[PDB]
DNA sequence: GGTGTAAACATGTTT
DNA sequence: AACATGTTTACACC
């Protein structure tokens, strides 16, 4: 079965694990599916939704290549706790 | 209101 | 001329 977790989620937990805090977005791909042996099947439909949460939420920040050798994706500073209790369970409210 | 899923579309890198 | 990477629009669900 599918974890309990939103692809919000997911893409937090990869940024948030990276020793720099920056990603690959293939390493987002890479973190999933070590951690989440569900997202092995049909990575066409769960990957392009990864793609498209980086570029709809304000949250998900692409930063460019410190140089060569795509783009880094990192967390807006304001989001970097959206989840309290890193259960990522659900995001805490506020404004 | 924030999700999930699908699709079209537009650049960029790799056979 | 196959891919990967982003951007954006549209609809059902909760
Ligand atoms: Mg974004």
Not at 2 to 24: D, H, V
Not at 46 to 54: A, C, D, G, K, V
Not at 57 to 77: I, M
Request: glycine share 4%; charged share 25%.
């Amino acid at each position: 079965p599918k974890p309990p977790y939103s692809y919000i989620a997911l893409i937090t937990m990869a940024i948030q694990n990276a020793p720099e805090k920056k990603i690959t977005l293939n390493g987002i791909y890479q973190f999933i599916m070590d951690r989440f042996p569900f997202y092995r099947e049909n990575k066409q439909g769960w990957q392009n939704s990864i793609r498209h949460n980086l570029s709809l939420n304000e949250c998900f920040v692409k930063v460019p290549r410190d140089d060569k050798k795509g783009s880094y994706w990192t967390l807006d500073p304001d989001s970097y706790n959206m989840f309290e209790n890193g259960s990522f369970l659900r995001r805490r409210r506020r404004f």
